[model samples]
Target: NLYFQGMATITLERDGLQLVGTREEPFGEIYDMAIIFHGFTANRNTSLLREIANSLRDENIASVRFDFNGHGDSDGKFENMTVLNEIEDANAILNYVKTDPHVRNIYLVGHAQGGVVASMLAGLYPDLIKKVVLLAPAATLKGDALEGNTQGVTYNPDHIPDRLPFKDLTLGGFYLRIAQQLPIYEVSAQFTKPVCLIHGTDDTVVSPNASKKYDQIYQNSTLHLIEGADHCFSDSYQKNAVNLTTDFLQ
Candidate 1:
């Protein structure tokens, strides 16, 4: 279903590769823009990301959702994906955001692994962001990799690979090593701004403790622990997220 004629296809490039994006307006001029980021191995069309954007639209916030290079409609390979590349993709997207005539305030919302990128971005550019929201952030990424989350993979904790089979995809070894050494906690705490960390109580993919740690780390923040919900935050989870995030941001 075509929800609004305001929706349009946009294309940005990262490392000279196509980073496809979708942007939506609320039928009038606007100032706020929330750039939404999807998680690892996920596309911009992910239900949770889409639902969040849809909710933002109702609040009259223009939103943009894009496929990171190597994911969804973008031109790249899964094996080459890394957090640095994601940050680059996000930065490239923001380049477009800054040039738009209607936007004044900038917001960021990230899910799962994307949350890690959002945190890093905020830390690097604190003055540029108005508000941030992280949903089920995969804080224990290094631990998860060591715990065998990526299938068909093996190695010394030190001997990271240039390529390794994982699920239906291949993971870059350098990226794997970066995951192990990423200072997610160390860097995230520097962003002393309004942050909302929401996590499902029953998430098995990433420990909910990750969210708890972020809650304490952020000097000004709130943590919402949703009971009986999983990593995906199915069903009613969407509306609840929409409410909490909008309440904090607006």
Candidate 2:
């Protein structure tokens, strides 16, 4: 039988939907694996996650980066995606990692909306997750929903529809409805491990306050506010963000 060669593209089944992702295996014995999660409308290969994955591999830590259901190569409709379903999608990967005999420690790295998912998952499986790193955690989504504002798009908070059209995308009413009630910090507080919270002070999409809130809830967390960085860290500040994550995780 042939074994996996290197960082390979793989397909995983989650609740009947095929979740496509990439996995990087370290040479020799494997001890640690970091599962990377991307933000809303982003895929596994997003620039930030990709940098983190390569950094992890250099540290000899295996990494798995996957697109949540309805994003990237995963099977599902974008309109059907909700915070709850994304959690389930992430759980599928967590389940897969649990079965690996070589991985002794599991870490989580997520950005934006994915950061919220990773934080909650760390809480759900506190003992299983050794450490966590959240970049620009979008804990403000609930507030945005309540204000009827998402990415500058306006909707009726009192009259959510079955499907709301958003900048070339259709958002299920359930998504906004659920977001209005999501207890992001309450659940994430269950995770007491070392957490690295990174946010950009200039980020307009998700305020830096989101990470500050996470810092407050977390028992052990370090908050890093990058100067002049945007939501995606598209500028030179990206290198600093990557270094901070690698230093913390390593």
Candidate 3:
């Protein structure tokens, strides 16, 4: 039986920026907390986020998964989103979690673009984050790399239509429009905290090479490549990611 009770919303403010998040199972007496960051064009309830939250709850850990500004239930226009804004939002969430009487340690888990955001946050605010788990993070967010196809083919703007659900959504917000490369690479080089990078060898969206590059750059990071797994990490990949992250956190 799953101990998690779905998702809840929380409004938070940081550095004059307003943010919202999906609060999951309570920590109760546990002092450790995990905050999940979803991928680009995805919401907090993404399957990976839910699965990880449930897995952590089973181990008596509390977790929170939140949509970035302009995405999901959060307020704001997507076009207004930028790397700076996302980082500020993350910082605000960290501040909120730190104030929680039950939270003594905090771990960050981010998927796709969220992974980049989490890494940047960990580097900027090392005092707050205890560890980080990155799932197929997008390494290059600018130029041809950003325009590269989902399968690592030639660059094509038309390929943007291939994006899952967001492809159909008409409104393009800041969260959707802002380029992700600058923050990802800049902060990644400075991060010193222990990091676990999980990537699918078969992943076409974000190449496994990206994880390898990150591991090479960060002094205290490990990369785990899942064989034959796709970008989503549907079944076995999901289980492996959860197990590795839980073990690392413990």
Candidate 4:
């Protein structure tokens, strides 16, 4: 039932939501597999996500990129999306890969809030995650959540109701409590894998300093700062970032 070349959809679950996703494997024997997690509202079909996946394919490396529980084709409501829950989704993704006998080495890459989940997963599954890549990662999840701010949304940090609305997306304060208890820096300290931290100079979301701070923490890491790039690395920077990461893994 395995398809060739392009990725294929797979199923998983958490909190009653039937999570949906896919895996893109090369035709020949593949040794390394990179799992990618998209940003808060973005999903597997993101432009940069496709760009990075194609780049990996060019190098003969396989990859897995999926929608988080509530994003893309995945089930659930965006308001209920939390870092803790997404971490569970991330865990499920890795677990799926581990079942494949062909995949020998595993790598992780993520963007924005998804970056936070990826880091958390790395901390939780150190033995399984071989290499790490963070794109405009929110290294200071606790501080930001407490301040009532995400990249494009504002909420009452002290008083978010059961369900809060922001932009076109609805969110819950449940994640704030979880963020306080599981801050990114502290949790990621336990991840002792090689990491490539990428950030843009003009990023209005998570500051470049956060990635710089991350570089200091990882036992062995490299910091790449692309000038004039925004949080998502929207344009040429995306290619730059993806190529650097592809080079890092190979």
* RMSD (Å) per prediction: 2.8, 1.7, 4.8, 2.0
TM-score of every model versus the real structure: 0.92, 0.97, 0.81, 0.93
Give the lDDT of residue 129 in candidate 2: 97
What lDDT score is found at residue 189 in candidate 1?
83
Task: Summing lDDT over every window of 10 consecutive residues in candidate 2, give the lowest-scoring window.
Answer: 1-10
Give me the runs in candidate 2 sitting further than 4 Å from their true place. 1-5
Give lDDT tens digits, candidate 3, residues 1-250.
Answer: 1343445678886555456676766535554789888876788887788888888876767788877876787767665565567777787788788888777689999888788888888888777688899988876544433564333334334334322223444333233334524656666667687999999999877778889988998889988999988887887677887788788777
Model 3 stretches astray by more than 4 angstroms: 1-8, 14-18, 26-28, 143-166, 169-183
Task: Report the C-alpha lDDT of model 4 over 43-145, residue by residue, as the tens digit.
Answer: 9878888888888877777888878877889998787778888988888788888888888789998887878888888988888789999988886767777
| lDDT for model 1 | 0.82
Off by over 4 Å in 4: 1-3, 151-156
Best model number under lDDT:
2
The clash count of every prediction, one per candidate, is 1, 0, 6, 1
Of the pair 1 and 3, which is ahead by TM-score?
1
Q: By summed lDDT, which 10 consecutive residues of candidate 1 come out lowest?
A: 144-153
Estimate the TM-score for candidate 3: 0.81
Clashes of 1: 1
- When sorted by lDDT, best at the front, the candidate numbers are 2, 1, 4, 3
Rank all candidate structures by their TM-score, best first, as comma-separated numbers. Answer: 2, 4, 1, 3
C-alpha lDDT (0 to 100) for residue 25 of candidate 3: 61
